[PDB]
Structures are given as C-alpha cells and as structure tokens.
Design a protein around this ligand. Structure first.
Ligand SMILES: COc1cc2cc(OC)c1OCCOC[C@@H](C)OC(=O)[C@@H]1CCCCN1C(=O)[C@H]2C1CCCCC1
Length: 128
C-alpha cells in the first residue's frame, strides 16, 4: 500500500540521513515558495499508525488543521516535512518513532515505538 511505496521509493528528508522521515510528492504544488519557521500553516491530512488501526483525519472535524511551523506544536517529522512542501502540494510521509512520539509514545492514543504514516495537503501558509 501507500506506506510500503514510501519505504520503497520515498526521499529521505532528514538532516542526519537516517531515513527517519521519508516523503513522496503525490500532487505537485504551485509556485516555488515553501514555508519558513514561524509561518502560520493550513493543511488537511489523514494519519494512521503504520501497522494497525488508529486512523485520524482533519476532514473529520470539518476544517483545516492549523499550526505555526517549527514552533513546538507538532511532531518533529511535521516541522521537517511540511517545510519542504508548496501551496497546493499533496505528500505522503512515513515516520520512524524518533521523529514522532519516541520510546515513550503518547498513551493511550499512541504506543511506544510507533511508526506513523500521513497524507498531507498544504492548503496555505501566511507570515507571522
Ligand atoms: C498525540 O495526540 C494526537 C495525535 C494526533 C491527533 C490528535 O488529535 C487530533 C492528537 O491529540 C491532540 C494532540 O495534538 C496532536 C499533535 C501533537 O499532533 C501531531 O503532531 C501530529 C501531526 C499533526 C496532526 C496530528 N498528529 C498526530 O500524530 C495524530 C495521530 C496520527 C496517527 C493516528 C493517531 C493520531
């Protein structure tokens, strides 16, 4: 499925090159600008645990998921990955635990040492 394709073909967008955050672009975006630290960012997304069935979607709540990039608000893999994306882009990210919720997890919702998969659409980003 989509996660395995990312394992197989995905680009390693980590600084350390440890395959901790793997990306495939699924719909190319517009322009060349990508968001900077501090930008207010608007996305839709569907996420799940790699092996298993906790699933989650922004669409479930009606509305975009909004956060400030690089400002502590999401897991490290999102600060890394969303920063590489363009307005209108859809991407797949596969994420090792070190860039998500770690050996601790976030129980009861997220287990210890969980790999995550997301599909992200970047709707917009605006300056602080
Ligand atoms: C660990 O707690 C949650 C995780 C998710 C969604 C949650 O609520 C909708 C959620 O509880 C509210 C806390 O805020 C989430 C922030 C830290 O989330 C993220 O950093 C990432 C990226 C941004 C979208 C949400 N995401 C998640 O990890 C989801 C998680 C994805 C895998 C399937 C289970 C939910």
């Amino acid at each position: 499925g989509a996660p395995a394709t990312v394992t197989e073909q995905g680009e390693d967008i980590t600084s350390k090159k440890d395959r901790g955050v793997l990306k495939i672009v699924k719909r190319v975006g517009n322009g060349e600008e990508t968001p900077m630290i501090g930008d207010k960012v608007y996305v839709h997304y569907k996420g799940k645990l790699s092996n298993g069935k906790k699933f989650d979607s922004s669409h479930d709540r009606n509305e975009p998921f909004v956060f400030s990039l690089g400002k502590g608000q999401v897991i490290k893999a999102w600060d890394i990955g969303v920063a590489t994306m363009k307005k209108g882009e859809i991407a797949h990210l596969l994420i090792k635990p070190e860039y998500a919720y770690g050996s601790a997890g976030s129980l009861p919702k997220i287990p210890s040492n969980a790999t995550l998969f997301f599909e992200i659409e970047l709707l917009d980003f605006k300056g602080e």
